[PDB]
RNA sequence: AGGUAGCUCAGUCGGUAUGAGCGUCCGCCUGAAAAGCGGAAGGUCGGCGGUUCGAUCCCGCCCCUG
């Protein structure tokens, strides 16, 4: 259902920002962006509808899917940056 | 091999690991760096994990022609150990320098052989234990005279790096 | 430092420990001894316990002027380990020589890294495990061709020191 | 003519990459190994841009080898 996708983006962008662990975010991904995700089921249903309803219904699906991707990508890079930074601190030694 | 004294100091300088990198000084002149390479550099470069590296500028190391004239004392030595608690980020070389500065001329050798952390010590702290060898040049050093030099070494460590004698 | 190959063989020669003494040979010529000193010699002499010693005759070591011309194969290597049970008094160098003699030219490196005794092996026995690195000079060696060289190495160890492949 | 997982390759004709061997990492096995089986992780599909609601797939240019 087009324009009803805004409830799936809000449910994803808040579940993505809530994850503070790479393992938690890995499960949040497949639930909201995986092959079985509702946002993925909206893209698979773009070749069965007629041609006249394909240029506009897909623009609302691609906009709702790219909005959730950016929230995931920016959250994945953030959590991986914090992980990498913590390794450098934990690996500190007395060089003298 | 160059017959020069060198100090190693904490530093951050790519491609070395910011927590496992030392800058090498001869006197107050920097001559290079050493330590483990940055894990991100290692990953992007396809290098083995944990690869380490060192680079020095030989032309910055002045050629030394020392003519030692050592005087060896044959008198017996006194062996004593001291255990000092400092903040965890106090470099071990600074604690030893402070001990050496307080011990005076009677101190012949100092060697760190234990670095301990745990609930016995407390958080943000670490315990260091040094083996001290005292020796007089003209007499058999007494246990008390050595302890006076040890007490002065402990007092010096307390003033310079905040070392607390362990109890 | 002398650029000579040396073999060490069990020997009994005072003041060395009869069970921890090696005689040193260059070819078939004896050049000296090494190992731990006899505990009775150490006791009577007031020496530190466990004192070790070595003495070689330099004039018996012929001066060598080798001109190496190595050929380095760039082709990939095959890594395989072999575990061999021998009698406990079979010297480990004899087992390695037998493995090397059976492996042939494909064997680039052999390294002993485990010496094991226990009820799994049996009394009067010991198990030795070697790391083998095979490499061909003109082709990428296959896993099978390396195993054929390994099987021949195991057969050679069986015939010369009675080594039994561990199972 | 091809470029696709770290490697070697099969394959996908605009709206789901799907994979196979090696390698790697685990599990069984060994006191520990190797070798074995067994499981698994593992992919802006050569780069920059058109076109398109959407490009590994079509168009332009460029990089790479035969």
Curated annotation (Swiss-Prot), chain A:
Subcellular location per the Swiss-Prot or TrEMBL entry: Cytoplasm
Quaternary data: Tetramer of two alpha and two beta subunits.
Similarity comment text for this entry: Belongs to the class-II aminoacyl-tRNA synthetase family. Phe-tRNA synthetase alpha subunit type 1 subfamily.
Name used for this protein in its record: Phenylalanine--tRNA ligase alpha subunit
Organism of derivation: Mycobacterium tuberculosis (strain ATCC 25618 / H37Rv)
Residues of the full protein shown: 3 to 98 of 341
Curated annotation (Swiss-Prot), chains B, C:
Cellular localization per UniProt: Cytoplasm
Oligomer and partners: Tetramer of two alpha and two beta subunits.
Family assignment from sequence similarity: Belongs to the phenylalanyl-tRNA synthetase beta subunit family. Type 1 subfamily.
Boundaries of every FDX-ACB domain copy: 73-166
Something else known: Was identified as a high-confidence drug target.
Name recorded for this polypeptide: Phenylalanine--tRNA ligase beta subunit
Source organism: Mycobacterium tuberculosis (strain ATCC 25618 / H37Rv)
Shown part of the complete sequence: 665 to 831 of 831
